Design a protein around this nucleic acid. Structure first.
Lengths: 53, 54
DNA sequence: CTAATCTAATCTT
DNA sequence: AAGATTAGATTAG
């Protein structure tokens, strides 16, 4: 029940370009920064590593 | 490149009711019978699963 | 209408 | 965590 805002996307792309493998430390933060479950953020990083190496 | 003919459409539609979730083999087989890449057969089945069940 | 793509998610080893 | 694959949304013929 969630479509991502362009700002969240921009915020994840920034964290991506920084380091593509955020430990659960980075991710919880990124969950707070965005208002998304941590679970949903890991998925985002897993898919993006697979479709843009 | 695209443009599937009515005949290609005809034999896949038959195979559709035959197997609604073709494994990588069923599709690989179906690529030869039609002359379309397996990749394009998968898209065809996943698009049609969403636009026409039953 | 239909092919193709991009995303979110699940599952397997 | 990668790999494949699903559904779904959408971009286009």
């Amino acid at each position: 029940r969630t479509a991502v805002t362009g700002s969240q996307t921009a915020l994840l792309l920034r964290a991506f370009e920084k380091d593509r493998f955020p430990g659960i430390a980075a991710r919880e933060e990124l969950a707070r920064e965005t208002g998304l479950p941590e679970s949903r953020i890991q998925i985002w990083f897993q898919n993006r590593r697979a479709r843009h190496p």
